[PDB]
Amino acid sequence: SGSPGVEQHTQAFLEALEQGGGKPLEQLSPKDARAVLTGAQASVKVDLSGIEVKERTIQANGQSIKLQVVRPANVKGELPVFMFFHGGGWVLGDFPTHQRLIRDLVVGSGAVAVYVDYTPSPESHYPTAINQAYAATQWVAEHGKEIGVDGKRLAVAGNAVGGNMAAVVALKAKEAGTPALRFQLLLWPVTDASFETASYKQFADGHFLTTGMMKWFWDNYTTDAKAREQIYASPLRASSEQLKGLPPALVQTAEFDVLRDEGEAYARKLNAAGVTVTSVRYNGMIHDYGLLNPLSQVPAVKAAMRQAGTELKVHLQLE
Amino acid sequence: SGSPGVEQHTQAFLEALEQGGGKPLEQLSPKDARAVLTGAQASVKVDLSGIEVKERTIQANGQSIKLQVVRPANVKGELPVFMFFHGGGWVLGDFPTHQRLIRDLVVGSGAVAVYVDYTPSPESHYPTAINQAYAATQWVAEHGKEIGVDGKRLAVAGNAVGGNMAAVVALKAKEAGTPALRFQLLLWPVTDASFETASYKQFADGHFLTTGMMKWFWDNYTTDAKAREQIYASPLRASSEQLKGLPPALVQTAEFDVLRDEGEAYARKLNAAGVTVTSVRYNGMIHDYGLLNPLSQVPAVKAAMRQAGTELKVHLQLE
Ligand SMILES: CC(=O)O[C@H](C(=O)O)c1ccccc1Cl
Ligand SMILES: CC(=O)O[C@H](C(=O)O)c1ccccc1Cl
């Protein structure tokens, strides 16, 4: 349960987890694992005011894809938009678990969020989810008026594997020459299918997200080692040339996160490629500080969320 | 803005509405009218904790029908269930606007809610919505295991026209001989397409729900006068014999509601037919006190909601 330097409320949260333990998450069935995140997010009162949510199914990727469009309440007009990709190791997560996080970004930015309901793992494996995610991003750019947004002012955002997804959709958009993205918001992202960074070693345990979880997560995503080496799986492996021309990025990392180092390394690589990057480490924080509803009123977390919303606003303004 | 006897917070709410007025709701387009309720429900922080929500589409009424299944968080097993039908004059309403109300009943009862996404008016007219509502009720009884409920322990619930819907689904279930319903929860229900009760005269104006709204609501539902005279439209017109054998009812009405009298009259008719009825008038309250999120922390409203949840629990227990 925690290290020295962990923010006090976070550290109380970690101690409570260890008290009355439970099996490691990765010993559970996907169904049961999913129930854990659902339960935890439901366990606490949180503010969801100021938004309006409507479902929309689209036809893209030769497929039906469900969207949750989340819009600032009582605002008329074609608003700018950001795609939102949820985290959860590809096994876990959905819209309701992530709804508070999304609410915060939407109300903070004044922009519309389009949550993409991508297929989980291991129901599907790489690269189904990211193809869905890219397809939906293309759809919003081209048909955004159908959901009251300006598809020409378009960002991608997400936490954890969702941050992986956002980084990869921006790579697929570069690669494909479309659509134009204003911004990429990478919240404590997964960027590499390797497990040997200093932060992976330091925080393997006792900080909610564990090394054991991460490896189980990737295994459910794909066991194909050649898949894992592709930049659309591990974007940290991309070269300068491949990174060149990517949209401006805000990268937030957590001090006590196994993903910390690979997140800050990717920010470094983007920078070396001439991409505009702001890389900020939130000290005292664990993985998913901005996601976990019990931590949603922690002052540091509120400050991170005000930043993430503001920086979205900044990049989504009229030309 | 209000009468003497209106509860203080409610009366403050009414004064704020009149200040910086706006057109009557019934001068708006359905789309715009819908936006008003959506905006108002989003305008305030409310507690949505303790539930888990999942969407499920079914095939019934020769149709695809969307359900939102709302379940007490972290409870394993086949739970009892109540259908939930939202209000909004058939023109307005949906799941998110009603989600807090539903959350309260779910967490209070320990039972699962099945919200039925029936087709609005005037997109559709009577009796499309109630046929959907009945169909979905039959579906849950027969296939409830598919969504983790015991369909044999099944109630209907709703507010306003949703209360109309619940009363009518119980009549359609009687009529059809199926399914078995444990209970009917009628929250300030619409029961008659007439507009001459004392409460309609007394509170025509200045208490949020107006006579002008109610008549516009019914017109959008159906202008067919012979439809309006059917017991599946105006269940107050039903006879003792038709009412005989209906499930136990809790009816809550609001003192300052145009629907008050027809709601308490229907309770009376049920009683005269030998049906078990509890009829309770919440004094100081306007129409939809239990729905409107700005009123959700008013002590009287909390007491009404604790009652509605408890009485659901009472009727949904194992034999
Ligand atoms: C043009 C705008 O997007 O404003 C941003 C900002 O103010 O940080 C920005 C983004 C990329 C490069 C420079 C700057 Cl200044
Ligand atoms: C059997 C049960 O549903 O308990 C109810 C209650 O306690 O009010 C009830 C319902 C109908 C008739 C009598 C009673 Cl007692």
Automatic annotation (TrEMBL), chains A, B:
Keyword Hydrolase part of the UniProt annotation: yes
The keyword Nucleotide-binding is annotated on this UniProt entry: no
GO molecular function, one term: hydrolase activity
Domain Alpha/beta hydrolase fold-3 stretches: 83-289
Keywords recorded for this protein, A-Z: Hydrolase
Gene3D superfamilies for the chain: alpha/beta hydrolase (3.40.50.1820)
Protein name listed in UniProt: Alpha/beta hydrolase fold-3 domain protein
Lineage: Bacteria, Pseudomonadati, Pseudomonadota, Gammaproteobacteria, Pseudomonadales
